Every structure is written in structure tokens, then in C-alpha cells.
Design a protein around this ligand. Sequence first.
Ligand SMILES: [Zn+2]
Ligand SMILES: [Zn+2]
Ligand SMILES: [Zn+2]
Ligand SMILES: [Zn+2]
Ligand SMILES: [Zn+2]
Ligand SMILES: [Zn+2]
Ligand SMILES: [Zn+2]
Ligand SMILES: [Zn+2]
Ligand SMILES: [Zn+2]
Ligand SMILES: [Zn+2]
Ligand SMILES: [Zn+2]
Lengths: 80, 82, 79, 79, 82, 76, 76, 80
Amino acid sequence: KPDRVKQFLEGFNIETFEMVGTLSNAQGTFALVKGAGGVHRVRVGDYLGRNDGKVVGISEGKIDVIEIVPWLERPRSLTL
Amino acid sequence: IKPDETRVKQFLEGFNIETFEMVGTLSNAQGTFALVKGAGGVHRVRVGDYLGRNDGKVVGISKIDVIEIVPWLERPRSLTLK
Amino acid sequence: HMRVKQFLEGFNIETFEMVGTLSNAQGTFALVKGAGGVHRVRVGDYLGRNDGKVVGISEGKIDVIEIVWLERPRSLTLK
Amino acid sequence: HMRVKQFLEGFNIETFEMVGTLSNAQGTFALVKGAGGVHRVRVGDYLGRNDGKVVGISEGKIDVIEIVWLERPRSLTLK
Amino acid sequence: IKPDETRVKQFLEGFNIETFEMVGTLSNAQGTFALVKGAGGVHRVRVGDYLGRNDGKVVGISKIDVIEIVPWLERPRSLTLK
Amino acid sequence: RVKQFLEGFNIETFEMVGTLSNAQGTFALVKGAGGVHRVRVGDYLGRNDGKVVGISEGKIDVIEIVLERPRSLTLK
Amino acid sequence: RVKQFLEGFNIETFEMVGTLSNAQGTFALVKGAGGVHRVRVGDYLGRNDGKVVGISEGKIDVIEIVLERPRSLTLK
Amino acid sequence: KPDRVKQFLEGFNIETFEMVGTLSNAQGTFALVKGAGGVHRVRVGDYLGRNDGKVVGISEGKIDVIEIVPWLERPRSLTL
Ligand SMILES: [Zn+2]
Ligand SMILES: [Zn+2]
Ligand SMILES: [Zn+2]
Ligand SMILES: [Zn+2]
Ligand SMILES: [Zn+2]
Ligand SMILES: [Zn+2]
Ligand SMILES: [Zn+2]
Ligand SMILES: [Zn+2]
Ligand SMILES: [Zn+2]
Ligand SMILES: [Zn+2]
Ligand SMILES: [Zn+2]
């Protein structure tokens, strides 16, 4: 079931985004996602796109997302 | 209530407020700023600054609270940190 | 007025903010937030895609004269 | 309290300024001007050569507890 | 005239004023700052800030003009751009 | 060997502040020399020929020559 | 060839802002990729294998491969 | 004859300074001089040290200075 305050990158089409790298720093790991006119530092547990796309993993140049669609889980990836 | 037609509009008034994200707050010796990611950069925005195309005046940073003027009435909006 | 075009001529002037002025032992510069950084711009430098020559920096304002041939003054002002 | 010493432990704490605070989606950091840059310092980080542990950031002040063994609280305050 | 013994001294009060250089001025949306090279960095110093070990209060930026308190009397000093 | 810009600083002035991996490779983010720079395995840091030999788990391993001498820069 | 960090940006996002010569060599100062970086002859800029072949008189000469194609970045 | 408002690096012994490089930018050429606890961008026509040491040239990793001493001109250099 889709649920919460939606994040910024939920207001745009996920197909327009691009994974451009992984950055880790003292606070943990982020995927660098180009979309909506900028590069965002996206964490595991953040959301991308219009279908409740939850970021569940960042590894090996790939973001793993689980969307919720008519409800079914539908994985998606964004890769370098 | 009505738009001030002789104030000189600020840079972030030239873009749709829906393309902006609140990414944090910075406080230094001069006071407190909201960090707004928009128009291809990150801007330091103060209370009393403006965001978006509807005279959205920043009235609080604590979340950014904005009051727009729309066809006139006052219409509050906010931008919240993830 | 209308040379090798300067860096900030490769972007739309409407994407730039005058954010301040800096003066140092070498002179006075306007600080222009544009093309993903802040640039130190002098009188005689150029901004935007229409030959926008900087002709004055003063009182938190940069005065620029574009050519669109007709010259057209505009400014960028500090909030 | 008295691990791999952090970068700002290799300099005299008396050379650092609290210059501000920044909060973002990850938490709150004090901005410490020291060792030729500005660092984003969290509670639990260390400053100076005497095990100065940051124990609080609040109201423009960083609270630090050094060990010199006797513990000695001090602070760094924003102007 | 006498030193204020309960104000919290500023960082640049922990160094000799003779080791500082005025390297420029910066003005932004918040106002005007003198850029002071000292104590291993460059600092943004405002009117009403302090420099040096003698309660040197910055009273003007335009050259930085400072008024120190010394054994009390007021003693003006300046730091000038090259 | 052609010298690198970050060899003109004492290695003690550098902090490892993270890692960036992208289509160009894996870089350590080293804070020093006026900003934050991106350093690869086989690049150098410091004044004693400090070659970067590993970037992994928030640590940069460096081997200097003075005798080979291992050094590291660890993410806080 | 091992790729360089500044190959992950469009070359048009870079400005030549000066030159630094010191004990490590002669570097062009290129403003882009989040700050100002120091680039030597034989380093690369941009997404088309833009090799830096000269740094002189406030100009950086670059040769891209797409056919060799000369580009330059000139100090204002 | 020694003459003007003295510059900052005139209040320190020139023998303590070090030439650490040459930087040119849109405004011209500077020598980077480490002294008095910092690195200064010094121009031709600036002064170094306590004996009216005028910088007369910056070239080839070398700063050429002409001091005035008991009066005689006395050249000095600072080199990488
Ligand atoms: Zn975001
Ligand atoms: Zn009202
Ligand atoms: Zn702005
Ligand atoms: Zn520029
Ligand atoms: Zn740090
Ligand atoms: Zn008085
Ligand atoms: Zn300060
Ligand atoms: Zn070996
Ligand atoms: Zn760099
Ligand atoms: Zn060829
Ligand atoms: Zn100086």
C-alpha cells in the first residue's frame, strides 16, 4: 500500500533521472542522482519518482528502487 | 493585501517555487539562513526574502514558511527538509 | 562593442545573481553566482549570450550593456 | 574518554573559531575555522591536542571536554 | 573609558594586531566586511568586531579604523590595504 | 616521475573526508590545498613520495619513501 | 588509459582562471567541478579525451579525439 | 634614498621569507611569498623586509628585490 511527507524527487518522472555516482562521507553513503535540474544526494530510505519508489540499496554503481504499482512491488534500477 | 509593484524582485522569484528544495539551515555571525536548492545552485535565503513567482515572502525558518499573494489573498506554503 | 568570448558568455544572463562586491589590492570585482560557481567579474568583462559588457559596478548593482543591432542596458542587483 | 585521532586533533585548539552551525538532512554540524579550512564537526568529534571531545553544539557554542588525568570543559563561541 | 571585563572576547583578540593585514573588503546582502589576514586564515570582520590584545574595536571600514583602550585612554589605529 | 600538485604540501595537512565512485573510477576525497580534491590509486600526497595504494572502508593507504613507510588517512 | 576525475564534466563548464608555477611544475588553474583545480600538460579535461598539450600566455591548449580537434580555454 | 605607507611584509626580516611559487591570473602576476605566518600574493612594485626591498621582477621561479642600504642599491633574490 502507498502511504508521509513526500520528498522533492517524488514530483518528477523517475525515467528522467540519472545515477552519476556514489559518494560516501562521515555520515554514510549517498547516490548522486541528476534530476529536476540539479544533482541530489539520495540515501537508502529516500524516494524517487511518482510511484513511491523507495531506495533500498546503493552498491556497485547501481541504485535499487522498489516502486509500488497497481498493489505490487516493482523493482527498478538506475545505473551509471 | 496586494502585490508590491515597485519592489525590486529577487533572483529566486524568476523560477517556479515547486522546483526548489529546502536542503538545510546555516547560522553564522550575521544570523540564520535557509539553504534552498534551486535555479542550478544552492542559495542562502533569509526571512524577508522571496521565493517563486507569486510574491512568496519567507516569514519563518525553523522548514521554511512562505506566504504567497494569489488572485488578492494570502496563501501559506512551506518547503520542508527530507 | 560588437574578441574571444568570456566564460560567462556561454550561459543565459537570466540565470546569474549579483551576490556582492569584493575589493582587494588589485581593484573591485562584482561576485556573480552563475554557471554553478561564483565568479569575480570586473568592469569590461562580459555576461550572457548577447555581448553583455559590464560597464559599472556600484551600490550593489552591476550595469551591463547587451547588443540584440540595438544596445540595451540592463542590470543585476544585490537583494 | 581516554581510537584513531581525528584530523583537528593535530592542531592547537586555540587556533580554531566557531563560525556557525549548519543543519541538513543528516544532522547538525558546527562549522570550525581551523587548519586552513572550515570543517563540519559533529557531537562526538574531537578538537585540539588534549582529547577535546565535542559534547554539545547549541546556541552558537560548541562544548568540548579535554583531558589534561583531569577532565576540563571549555567552549568555542560564535562572535 | 575602560575595558569591558564581561564581554566574551572574539577570536582575533587572541593575537597581536601587528600580525594582521587588511587584504580587502567584501560586501554582500548582509552588509560590509573587512577581510583580515591573520591567525593562519582570512577573516570577515564587521564594524563592532574586535582585533588584537587591547580591546581594539573596529569602528569603521572604508582602511579599517580601530580604537584600542590602553593604560585608561582611547588610542586609534588603522590597518590599510596595500 | 612527473610530480603532482598535492606533493607540494605536508601530508599532515590533509584529511580524508570520503570516497566518490563514478564512471571515471573510485577517488578519495582529500580536504587540503585550498579545497577538496579527488585522488586515485597511484596518485601522490605529501612531500615524501606518498603513493596512494588503496582506497577502501573510508581509509586511504599511502606508502612513502624516506625505507618504505606506510601512512594512512582515515575517515572520521 | 586510467581516466581522470575532470573527464566526468562537459569541457564547456570549465574556465581557465590562471597559472601556477612552483617546485612541482606549471599547472593551469581550471575553475569547474566544484572549485578550482590544478591541471598539468598531459592531464585531461572534458568528455572527449581532451588532453592538455600546452599551458602558456594565459591559454590552455587541449586536443580532443572525436579526428583530432583542438580546443582552448583562454584567460579573460 | 629610502622614502610612503609601508606594506605589511616590511615589518619582518626578509631572510625568514620563502618564495613558494608564481601565480598569474586575470589581474597579472604574483609571487607567493611565505612569511609572517601566511602566504602573500606579492606584486612587482610591492616591498619585502626591513630595508625598503622593492620587488622589481618575478620570473623563472625567482623574485628580484632591490634593497636600499647604507645609500647603495643591494639586489637580493628569493628562489624556489
Ligand atoms: Zn534533494
Ligand atoms: Zn498580511
Ligand atoms: Zn541567491
Ligand atoms: Zn569567471
Ligand atoms: Zn574535518
Ligand atoms: Zn569613547
Ligand atoms: Zn573570524
Ligand atoms: Zn613496496
Ligand atoms: Zn583538484
Ligand atoms: Zn596528434
Ligand atoms: Zn600581504
